[model samples]
Target: PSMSITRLFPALLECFGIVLCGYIAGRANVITSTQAKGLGNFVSRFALPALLFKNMVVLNFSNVDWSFLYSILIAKASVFFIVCVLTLLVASPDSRFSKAGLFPIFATQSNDFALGYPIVEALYQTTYPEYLQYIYLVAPISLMMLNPIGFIFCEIQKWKDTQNASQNKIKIVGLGLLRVLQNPIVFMVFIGIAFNFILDRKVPVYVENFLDGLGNSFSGSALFYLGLTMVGKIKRLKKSAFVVLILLITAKLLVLPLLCREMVELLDKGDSVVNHTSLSNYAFLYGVFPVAPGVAIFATQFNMEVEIITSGMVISTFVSAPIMYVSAWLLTFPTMDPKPLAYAIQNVSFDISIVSLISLIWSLAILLLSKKYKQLPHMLTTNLLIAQSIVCAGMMIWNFVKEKNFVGQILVFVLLYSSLYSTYLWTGLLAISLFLLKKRPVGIIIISGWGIPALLVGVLLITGKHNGDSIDSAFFYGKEQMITTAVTLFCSILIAGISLMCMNQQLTRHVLLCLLLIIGLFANLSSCLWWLFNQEPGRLYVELQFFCAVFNFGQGFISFGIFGLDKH
Candidate 1:
C-alpha cells in the first residue's frame, strides 16, 4: 500500500515541522533552557492532562476490547521486565538502581501522544475512527503502572547518592507513590475515569468545549517541547556512546514492536469481538513509536542517563518513521485473500446485472410519470427516482466491467458508493416529505442528497485509498459498513412509523409504503447480517451470503414492484 505511505507522509511532516521550529527556537536562545522547562510544565500540567481527561471522559466503555488492551499491557511489561533485569545484571552497584529503572522506561514507554496519535489518526480516521481512542487508553497504562516502577528506582538511587543510609526503605516507596499521585497526568487520568463512570460518559457541553480548547493544543506543544529537549544533546554523544544509543534506538523502534505483534497474535486466539487483524496492525505500529519525550523529562529530574535518553529520543523519532512505513507495508503484503462470502457474492454478477437493468427501466418510467403528474409528492418521488436510476445504472456498469485495471475499478467504486449513498439520502427525504404531507424546502433536500455523498466519497477517495484487495467484495466489512447499516435502518424505521401513523388517511398508499420499507430494510440488513456471521465457520455463513446477495442486489426491482404497481 504505497498509497498508505502517501497518506501518512503529510501528517508526519506536519509533526516534524513543528519540532524543527522548537529546535530552532532553542538553538537560537529565543527561549532559554529554564523557559523551555516552563513550557514543558504547561504541557504536562495543562495541555496533555486536558487532552487525556477529555478523551477518557467521553470514551465508550461498552465497546472496549479488553483482550486487545491486555495484549498491549503484556507486551509492554515483557519488554520492561526484560530490560530491567538485563540492566540490573550488567550494572555496577552504584549505578544499578538508576540504570535498571531508566532503561526499562526507555524500552516500554512510547511517544503515543505527541507522535503516535497524529500518525494513527491520519491513517485510520476515515476507515476506523475508534482507533484513535486506543492511543488514549494506552497512555494510562504507562501513567499508572509502568512509570511508577521507574520513579521508585530513580528515588531509591537519589537516597543512595546522598549517602542517606539512615533513610527507611518503606519511606522511599511511600515517597514514590506520593510523587506519582502528585503527577498531574496521573491525577487527571483517575479523575477522568471517575467522571466517566459516574456521569455515564456525559459531560455538559460547555465543560467539554472548554476541555477541547485546551486539549487541541497538546500535540503541537508536546512536539515542540520534545524538540527543545533535543537541542545540544545530540552533539555531546561520545563515539563510544554510539553503541548504547544504537541499542536503545533498536529496542525502541524494532524489538519492542515485534514483541508486541507476537503477543497480540498469541493473545488473539481467534476469539476477538473486534477485527483481530486491524488490532494487531495497530499494536505493532504503536510499538514502534519513539521513546516518550517524558523519558527525557524523567532523566533530567533524576539525573540519570540524560545525554543518552535525549539523543536516543531524537534519533529514534527520526528512525521510527521508516520502520513504521515498512511495518504498514508488510501488514498489507502478499495481497489479502478476499473473503469466501465476498467471492461467492461476486460470482452472481450476471444475476445482479439483470435486476439492475429492470430497475433502471422502471426508474426511468417513474421519472417521466412523476414529471407528468407535477405535484410536490410526485416531484419528491422524481428526485428519489433519479437517485435510484443512478444506483441501478452504477450497479449495471460495475457488473459489466470485466477488466481489473486499478483506475477503472476505482471509478466504479466511487460511482457505486456515491450513487448508493445518494439513493439512501433521497429515500430519507421522501419519507420526511410523506410524514409531513405538507411542502418543505426542496432546495436543502436536493443539496444535501447530492452534496453529502460527494463529501463522503471525496474523503474515502483520499483517506481510504483503494488497495485492490477486496475490490470485488459487495459488502463494506468495517466501520463504514456498520454506518451504512445504521443509516439504512433509521430510514426504514422512519418510513414504517410514518406509514403506521398515516394508515387511516390513505390505506392503499400506506400499504405500499410499508411494503417498500420492509423490502428496503431486508435489503440493507442482509449485508449487515453477512458481516456479523463472517467469522463463523459453518453452513450458516454460506446461507447468509446467498441471502445477502439476493436481497442486496434485488433492491432495485423490489422497489420498482412496490412503488410502480401502486396506482395513486
Candidate 2:
C-alpha cells in the first residue's frame, strides 16, 4: 500500500516534539540523570503500566492465540541471548565490556510505549484506521526485551568486578536473577501482565487518559535528557580502541545480527506458542536499531567503556536504524504478514526519524573525532565563537521583528544572544590563546540538555507568529515568502553552526554539549510543538528543519569536545 502522507503525518509531528523537548531540556540544565530517573519512574510504574493493562484487558484474548505472545517472548529472548553471548566473546579480559554490553539490549531495544503505540492506534481504530501493528511489531520485540538487557548487563558487571573471577560462577547467575527481581520496571511489567490476565472487564478511558498524559512525558522529557547526556565526552586514548570500536560496532550490528538470523530460523520449529506466524527470521533482526546513544550515559554513570561504547553508538544509530526496515522486511514471516496483522500494520516513515537519530548521533561523534584528531582547539573554538556572535546578533534582530514583538523580541533577543555570543567570544579567545601557546586548555563548566529548548517551544507556540504586519520592518509587500525563506535558511545554518561550535569547544564541552542539546531540543521542539497544536507549513518540512538542526549540533559538539580532550 502507498504511504498516505496524511495518515503518516502524526509520527513526524511527535518525533519533532521528542527531539526538541529533549534538546531544550539539556540547554536549560534541567535534564539530569536524577530527573531522568524520576521521569522514568513516574511513567514506568504508574502510567505505562496502566496504559498496557488497559490495552491488554480490553483486548479480547478469547480468540487471540496465546501462542503469539509466547512466540514474541521467545523471539525477544533469542535476540537478548545473542547480545549477551557476542558481548562476552568480544570483551577484553580486564575491560568492562561485559557489564557495558548489557545496555545495548535496553538502549537499542524499543521503547514500545513511546515509539510503537501511536502507529498501532492509527491502524486498529475504524474511523481513523490507525496503524495498530506498528505497536504490535514493537511490543513483541521491545517490551519483552529492553529491561532484561539492563538487568543482565548489571549482573555481568557486578560479577566481573567482584568474586574469585572464576570460583562459583553460578553465583553470578543466581545473583543476576535476584537483580532482575529487584528491578522496579520489570516488576511493573509483571503486574501489568497479571492485571490483564485477571481482569476480563474493560477499563475506563479516564484511567488510560491519565496515564497517557503522564507516560507521554517520556517522549519529551525522556528524550530531552538523551540530548543532554551528550554533554560529556570520553577520557584517555588507546588508538587500539578505535580499531576495537569499529569491530564492536561491526559485530554488534552485522556479525551478531547474522548469527541471530540462523538461530531464529531454527527456533521456528518445535512446539512454540506462535500459531499465526513463523517469526524466527525477523525476531533477531529486530535487535538492530543502530546503536543507541542512551547507552553512553549508562556507561558514563558506571565509568565503563565510554569511548568505545559512544563511538559505536554515535554512528550506528543513523546508518543502522533506517536499515531496520530492511531487517523488518526480512524478519516478518510468511504467516504473520498475510491479513489481520497486515491490517494493523503501518510503516513509520524512516526518512525524518532516521535523519533525526543519525543527526544527533553524528553530532556527538564529530565532537569526539575532532578531539581525537586535534582539528578543533581552544584558539579555533574562540574564532568560531567570534563569527558565531556576529551572526547571532543579526538573527536576534530578525527574530524579534518576525515575531512581531519588535520591542520585547528585540530587547530579549539582543540581550540573550549578545550575552551568549560574547561569552563564546571571550571563552573562545582564551581557549585559542592557550592552544596557540601550545598549552592544553583546561575544561570549563557549562550546562547541557534539551530542557530549555522544550520550554522555549512552549513559549513560541503560545506566542504565535504575527500575520497583519512585519515584526522586523525588513519586509516588502510581496516579500513574505522571501522573508520566510531567508529566515528559515538563516535559522537553519545558525542553529546547526551554534550546535557544531559548542561541540567543538574543548574548554567547556560539558556545558556546551548541554547548550547544544537545548539548541537542538527547542530548535526542533518549537516546530514540532507548533505542528502538533496547529498543522500548517507541512509536517515534513518542519520535521526536516528540526532534525537538520539536531544533526548539526550533535556532530559539531562531539568534534569540538574530542579536540579539547586531546589538546589538554
Candidate 3:
C-alpha cells in the first residue's frame, strides 16, 4: 500500500510550493494598498487554474454515480428553502435582507463551492476520479442558482429600503429575472452537462480534452481564490458578521453533513446509482465543503453582506479541507484505492482497515476540537492555537525522526512550518490584545512573535532539503533552500512590528493597519523568493509584464474602487 514515488513526490512538491507561496505572499510590499489583493487575483484566476484544469476535467464522468446529484438536492435543498422562507417571515426594522433575506442567507449563506469541493477531489481520487461531477455541479448550484437568488433577495431588500425611506411602495423594478436567467454561466453549465452526456456516448479525444480543460479552470482555481479572498476586509466586519460566521461553520462542518446522513437513512432507496452505499455520504460531504468563491465575489458585486459570507468561508475552510478524506475513512464497506494517506494508514490496522478507524478518530478529534474552540474568540483563539502549533510540530518531528523515514521527516517539517507561519500571523492580533503593550520590547513582542514561526519553517526546510535530496548539499550550502525567505520574512515582521511599537507610530490606527499589511505581504514575498532576488537587472527583461501590470492595476482597482466604502 506504499505510495508511488511519482504521485507522492509531486503532491509533496505542489503542497509545499503553495504553502511557501502563501507564507511569502502574506508579507509583501506595495506602492499602494493593493499588494495582497493583486496577488490574490493572479493566484485565483491564473496559477490555480493551471493546477485544477490539469487534474479535474481530464477524467471520465460517463460512469459517475449520477444519482449523487439528486441526493445532494434532497439532502441540502430543504434546509436551504426553509432558511429562505424564515428570513422573509421574521419582521425586522433592520436592513430588508435582515427581515426576509436575512433569515435564509443568514442561516443558509455558505462558502461551500469556494472551499469544500477541492478537499473531496484532492483526497479521494479513484482511477476514473469520481468527484469531477461534484465539482461541475458546485458552481451551478452556488452561482447559477444561489447567486441570482441572493442578488434578487438583496435587490428586493434595497427596493423595500427605498420604499420605507420614501414612505411609499413603488412597483418599479429596473432589472428583470429574464436577464438573470440569461447569464453566460447559466448556459455554461448547461453546455457542460450536454457536452458531458454527449461525450460519454462517443468522445472525440481532441474535443474531450478541450472540454476537460475548460471545465477544470473552474475547479482548483476556485480554492486559491477562496483563500486569497478570505484575507480581505475583516476590519469592516460587523457584529452580526461574527454570528453569521458561527452559523456557517455549524452548517458546513456539522449540520449540513449530519442532516444529509439522516436524510440518506430515510431515503433508503435513492442511492448513488454508481457507488451505491457511498453515494449518500458523497452527497452529504459535498454539502459540507467551503462556500463557493463565486459567492463571495457575487456578494461583493451586489453589496450584500460580504463579510458574512467571507467569514463563513474562512472559518469552514480548515474543516472542509479534511472532510473528504475523513468521510472515506468512516466507511466500513467499500475501501479506498491504495494511495497517499490510505496507503500509509493501511498496514497498521486492527484488520478492519485503518481508514475506518482513523476516520472515526479524526472526526471525533475535529468535532471535539471545534466545540472547545467555539466559546473562545476566533481571532485571539486562532493566534494562541497557532502559537501552540510549535509544540505540535516538535512532537511530529520527533516521531518522524524515530521512524528514520525521510518522507515522514519532510512531512513533519511542512507541518511545523505551516503551524509557525500561522502563529506568526496571530502575533498582530496578540499585539492588539495587549493594546500594543510590550512586556519586553513592544517591537520584540510583535516581531519575534512572527520570528518564532518563520524561523521554525526556515530551519525545518533546510533540514528537509538535505533529507529530500542528498545531492542538494553539493549544490547548495543550505538544506531547505525553499524556506529561507519565509524565515527571513517572519523575522522581518518581528522587526517591523517592534519598530512600529517603539516609534509609537504617530499615524492613525487605520493607516497603521494598511501600512502593516502592505509591508508584511512585501516582506513575505521577499523571504520566500529570496533565491529569485535581484536588483534592476532582473527587471531588464519584461517578465510576464502584461500579467504583472494587470495584477497590480486590477488589484488596485478592486481595492481603491471595488472594496472601498463611501468615505464621504
Candidate 4:
C-alpha cells in the first residue's frame, strides 16, 4: 500500500494543472468573469448531470453491500448533523456569517469527482472494481442530499429573518424543494433511479457513448470554471471568512475522515464486500477528499458569500496535496483501533439519547432564551422563527445522534485537541467575539461522493492495446505525455509570471497554491502521465484528456492571486 511517489504525485499534479489552467484563463480574460459563470452553469447543468446519470444508470444494486452502503450513509449524515449543530452554536443569531446557511454544507461535502476518482482508479484498477461501485452509491447521496441542505437551510434562515411571515415560510420551503428538484445532479440521480425500475438500467451503446463523452467533459470544465472563479475573488475575502475557512478545512480534511474511518470499521465487520480492505480504504480516502468546487458555485448561485466558501476550497485543496502521499503510507500500515468502533457501538442506544436529548434541549434552550433576552434577531421578532430555529436545530441534532453514539473523547480526540481544550478555546473566543463583537464568530461544515459503473461492462475497451497487428503502448504514452507537458508548461508560465509580478507579496501568503501547483506538475509528467499512458487505452484518452483540456484556462486570475494572496 506504500504509494509510488512517482505514480501518486502526478495524478495530484494533473489536477493542479487543470485548476491552474482555469485560473489562467480567468485572469487572461479567456474566461472572463461573466464567462466563468456561464462555464459553471454548463458543467453543473449539463455535464455533471450527464455524468451522474450515466453513473447511476449503470449501478446494479441487486448485489449491493447493505452494511457498507448504510454505514457510510449513516456516518456521513451523522457528521453533517453534528456540524449543523456546531454552526448554530458558534454563529450568533443574525450574524452575517449565519445568513448563508452554507457553513454546514461546506463542512460536509467532498470533491469525490475531480481528485477522488484518479486516486481510486490507481488504487483499484481492475483488482477491486467494486471499490468504484461504492463511489456510485456515495456520490449521489453527497451530491443531492447534502447539497440541497444548503438551499434548505438558507431558506429557513431567510424565513426566520422575515418578521411574522407564515406564508413566506411555506414559499421558502417550496422554493428550496424546487431548487432541489431543479438541480441537474439531483434530477439526473432520480432519472437514474427511474431507469433502474423501468428500463432495468439498460443503456444502448450510443447512449452510453453519448453520456460518457459528456461525463468526460465534467472534471476538466468544472475544474477550469472553479479556477476561473477562484481567481476573481482573491481580495474579496474577509479576515473572519479566512479564519472560518481554515477551521472548516481542518475539520473536513482531517477530523471528518477519522470519524468516518471509525464508523466504517464498526459496521463493516459483518459484511463481505463492506469489510473488504479496499472498501474501507475507499471510504477513508473519500473522507479526506477536498470540498467540491461545486460548493462555491452553489453558494454563489444561491446568493451566499462566494468568497468565504471558495477560500475554504482553495486552501483545503492546496493543504491536502502533499498530504495525499501519507494516505498510501497509512493504508499499508493501517492501525485501525477496533476499540473505538466497538466502544461507540456498544453504547449506541444510550449515547444516542444522551447526546440527542441533551444537544436538542441545549440548542432549543439557546433559541428560546435568546428569544427571551432579545439576543437572537429575526427569531425574537416572532415566535415562528424561534420555533423554526429550535425545530430545525433539534432535527439536525436528533438525526446525528440516533444513528450512532455521539459523545465522548472520540470526536474531539479525532480533532487535534481534547474536548476540554476545544471547549476552553470555544469559551474564550465566545467571550471575546460575543461580548466585544456581539457575534458568534466561528463554526464548520462537511461534504462528500462520485462515479463510474462497476459491474455491467463486458468489454475492456481501454488504453493499452487490442488484438492489433503492431500497436505499442508508447504511442498512447506519447499522447498523454504531450497533453500533460503542455498543461504543466502552460501552468508554469502563468504561475511564475504571476509570482514575479507580485514582488510585494510574501511567499507565505500564496505559497501552498504555488508550491503544490509546481510539484504536482513535475510529478504528473515524470510518473502519473506515464502511468496513465500504460493503462487500458480508453482511460488515459478519455479521463486524463478531459482533465488536461479544461484546466488549460487558468491565467490572469492566478496572477492577481499571486500578489493579492492571503493563504489563511
Tell me, by lDDT, which candidate is best. 1
Model 4 residue 380 distance off true place after TM-score fit, in angstroms: 60
User: How high is each candidate's TM-score?
Assistant: 0.57, 0.47, 0.50, 0.56
- Candidate 3: where are CA atoms >4 Å away? 1-27, 30-66, 89-91, 96-99, 102-118, 138-148, 162-184, 193-222, 236-241, 268-277, 318-568
Model 4, poorest ten-residue lDDT window? 445-454
**lDDT for model 2:** 0.44
Candidate 4 has an lDDT of 0.52
What is the per-residue lDDT of model 2 for residues 444-562, given as tens digits with 9 covering 90 to 100? 31121111222332333234343234332212123432333233323433444454454467445533543454444345435334444554534244334324333322223333443
Question: How far in Å is the alpha carbon of 19 misplaced in model 3?
Answer: 7.3
CA lDDT of every candidate: 0.67, 0.44, 0.44, 0.52
**Clashing residue pair totals per candidate (backbone < 3 A):** 0, 59, 34, 35
Tens-place lDDT per residue, model 3, 278-327, is 55555565555555444455556556556665555455554454353334
How far residue 175's Cα lies from its native spot in candidate 3, in Å, is 3.7
Query: Candidate 3 — what's its lDDT?
Result: 0.44
The sequence of per-residue lDDT tens digits that candidate 4 reaches over residues 344-406 is 222221222232233334434544554433332222122222222232232233234423454
TM-score of 3: 0.50
Q: RMSD per prediction, one decimal? A: 23.6, 14.4, 17.2, 24.8
